[PDB]
């Protein structure tokens, strides 16, 4: 009924993300596709869990028995896929991953032509196929069956894409690299070392089970002790499939998506580069990122989150430059999709052009301070209104004067309601919370 | 009911011999080997069948969805298979492939540990699965899912393992190959090359839809031809997975599996290698075959059509060599299986061994005449017993005594019984059938 999530298809391989829909969705899906040609070409990507192997050859198989020409890349990161995709006019990219998420879990994900997302119509006519419970489409035999020519090569045409957006050689820089064991161990390595950095790694000894294994974007505290242990001058982590980008400084604290999008677009303006001097973000987004864009007279475009909304609305309105502070960040003059290794080469870029260590651009951008606390209530949805609770909010903002943002909201899996403040100390924080606390606690308990 | 018939599992690509069904295949066969081992080692080979990648992603899908450790093989010849995987002690060995059928066809064939085919009460375990409705097997999910370790060097290992069984090298001698645009297309020109002959080659451009399109073992035509024009010594002319070999002389006629198996058998024998002089064939034989067997001192057992009948026997008493008229030849001391590259290596052996030209060798061997007529009948079923059709064959076979043979059975196919004499002239032939023919034309008609 709904297969397509935000991810595309997710489950636990094997258990729930079976082989046998993996067929399905390549059989069906290169059939939604062959009303352009009836020999679409379709390109495939993984990641480097072990399960990738077992939905490829599924996947590949229903891709052959509709007729799909289907090329295999072998593991590399999704913006490689995206690239890829636009850059040999195939008509889709599937990439076989789950990003972040531990081992056992995979995903597909498809890209249509454009490099961009299926169009929402198409992967509806897929789901609408898939919960016919006969299979009444064509079974191509002898010649008219698919087609299969590997492109292993593909990652290294995407890396000399990229190798050509860097400004200069990065000699002089010593940069760490955390792959997450996953789609950049072996594209990042080749990548900077090509450029000329002087190359510390870790977690790019992927094996199939060890992706995202207290490595990678979303455990950087591991990175943070490599750059401090070999003294380098700032430290990269990329996610499962290489999406995301999380930096660390020469003192080794994180450097987020936030704080790179600041640095980053702050480079592009200084070189007329970045477009309308705008950058699209997610409400997501800390305070004084806002706060440091103003000071340097960026405007801002502030979406929901998700990736389909930055890039819609950047797509909507010209944007060059778009953003989570996950580190999922969008250069449209040359992808499609996040890209952690351009955000690293944008980054490194910005490292040589200014000569500052990143410490020092990361200084730029104050970061507000934040505060949870957690009430529990006696029915955590009759808080949205209440002439007390509803009251003590609108107080708190307007005196914070936008220097500071509440938010305030029911907890989902539980019973008890989330008070959430910006301020621009941590005792602004304290304050402005428990005065919003107090009076929920009035209420329920 | 049956999916294994003598070939194993059988049909046109996607029709019949779906991405499904080799799905269940690969599935439930590693289930019913996963009793030993719990992660069994599997190796898969195929032929250049377009077929065989849709059919290979979907067979190894099920093999990694029970856990047992897949490794390809990329395109190997069915001997490579047998050769591997006794000689890398896995559990199981997999070739797709449809041997000499046409390239809309495939098929999935079973080696266990051994070597030899899968024991039968394996293969009926699977077939007994394959008909319940409701898959309970298990699904490891995580590090219990299966895990794939290409080799793809294993035809290089399987090569080196041939070049060994090499008297000497074949210097000076100018060799022809027809590889039918098969599994054999690069073992057999590096193979040949690597032993210094010459080697003018021909069915050695496959590209998935051209195997057996007028080349190999079973339309020798071709080479025949490419022989003479090329003034080569011999043609050697494998067929789609490299089981078969038939021969071609310096004056372009055929030599088929009897004067083969006589050549080297007779080669075997006079250097104490044929084990106790004795020859292992098929009813299918020349009877000439035969004459020249006794000859030259070597006994014979002869068997029921079927590799597996012809193994089963060398098995039994630890006869050395077997084989049928098709070319397929079993070399037990060297390998399980029949295997073109083998048989084509003690050819040469002995080419050179003896220096005589493969014209002369072939002639020791004298074919008697065959002769076949079709009689139409009024029902073919009431001519097993008959007073005067049955007396006229009893006494035309005691006539000829031993130096001549008949056959007459009914036609499947249609309403006509097949009258077939060997004799040792083409006379002799077309007298000693129309004595028989005439009489059943005096009953049916
Ligand atoms: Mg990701
Ligand atoms: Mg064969």
Redesign the interface.
């Known amino acids: 009924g709904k297969y397509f999530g935000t991810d595309g298809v997710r489950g636990?391989?094997?258990?729930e993300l079976?082989?046998?829909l993996?067929?399905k969705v390549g059989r069906f899906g290169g059939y939604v596709l062959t009303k352009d040609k009836q020999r679409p070409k379709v390109l495939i990507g993984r990641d480097t869990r072990?399960?990738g192997?077992?939905?490829?050859?599924?996947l590949?198989?229903?891709l052959?028995?509709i007729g799909a020409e289907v090329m295999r890349l072998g593991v590399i990161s999704t913006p490689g896929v995206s690239y890829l995709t636009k850059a040999m006019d195939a008509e889709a990219g599937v990439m076989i991953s789950a990003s972040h998420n531990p081992?056992?879990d995979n995903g597909i994900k498809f890209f249509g032509g454009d490099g961009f997302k299926l169009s929402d119509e198409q992967e509806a006519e897929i789901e609408r196929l898939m919960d016919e419970p006969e299979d009444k489409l064509p079974?191509?035999?002898?010649?008219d069956?698919?087609?299969?020519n590997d492109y292993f090569e593909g990652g290294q045409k995407y890396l000399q894409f990229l190798k050509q957006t860097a400004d200069e050689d990065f000699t002089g820089i010593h940069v760490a690299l955390d792959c997450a064991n996953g789609a950049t161990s072996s594209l990042a390595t080749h990548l900077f070392a090509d450029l000329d950095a002087d190359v510390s790694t870790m977690g790019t000894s992927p094996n199939?089970?060890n992706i995202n294994d207290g490595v990678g974007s979303t455990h950087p505290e591991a990175l943070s002790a490599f750059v401090k242990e070999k003294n380098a001058d700032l430290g990269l982590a990329f996610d499962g499939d290489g999406d995301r980008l999380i930096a660390v400084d020469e003192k080794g604290n994180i450097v987020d998506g936030d704080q790179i999008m600041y640095i980053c677009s702050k480079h592009l303006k200084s070189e007329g580069r970045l477009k309308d001097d705008t950058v699209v973000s997610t409400v997501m987004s800390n305070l004084g990122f806002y706060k440091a864009l103003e000071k340097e007279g960026i405007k801002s475009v502030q979406t929901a989150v998700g990736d389909r909304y930055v890039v819609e609305a950047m797509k909507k309105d010209g944007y060059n430059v778009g953003g989570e502070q996950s580190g999922h960040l969008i250069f449209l003059d040359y992808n499609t999709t996040g890209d952690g290794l351009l955000s690293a080469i944008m980054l490194m870029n910005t490292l040589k052009a200014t000569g500052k260590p990143l410490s020092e651009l990361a200084a730029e951008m104050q970061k507000f301070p934040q505060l949870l606390v957690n009430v529990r209530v006696t029915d955590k949805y009759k808080v949205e209104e209440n002439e007390k609770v509803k009251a003590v909010i609108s107080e708190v903002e307007k005196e914070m004067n936008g220097d500071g943002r509440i938010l305030v909201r029911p907890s989902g899996t539980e019973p008890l309601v989330r008070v959430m403040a910006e301020a621009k100390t941590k005792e602004l924080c304290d304050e402005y919370v428990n005065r919003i606390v107090e009076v929920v606690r009035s209420e329920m308990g």
Chains 1, 2 share one sequence.
């Open positions: 636990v391989a094997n258990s079976t082989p046998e993996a067929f072990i399960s192997h077992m939905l490829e050859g599924a590949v198989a229903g052959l028995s081992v056992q079974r191509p035999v002898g010649a069956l698919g087609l299969v199939g089970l």
